[PDB]
Amino acid sequence: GAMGSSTSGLKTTKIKFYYKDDIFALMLKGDTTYKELRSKIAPRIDTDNFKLQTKLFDGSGEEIKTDSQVSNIIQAKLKISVHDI
Q: How far apart are CA 42 and CA 16, in angstroms?
A: 15
Fold of 1-85: Ubiquitin-like (UB roll) (3.10.20)
Identify the CA nearest to 32 among candidates 5, 51, 10, 52: 10
**Per-residue 3-state assignment (H helix, E strand, C coil) for the chain:** CCCCCCCCCCCCEEEEECECCCCEEEEECCCCCHHHHHHHHHHHHCCCCEEEEECCCCCCCCCCCCHHHHHHHHHCCCCEEEEEC
Number of Cβ within 10 Å of residue 15's Cβ equals 24
- Which amino acid type is present at position 13? T
Checking phi first, is residue 43 left (phi over 0); if not, alpha (psi -120 to 50) or beta? alpha
**Spans of all domains in the chain:** 1-85
Identify the CA nearest to 17 among candidates 77, 58, 68, 67: 77
Length of the chain in terms of residues written: 85
Method for structure elucidation: NMR
Contact 58, 42 (CB under 8 A): no
**Rounded (5°) CA angle 77-78-84:** 135
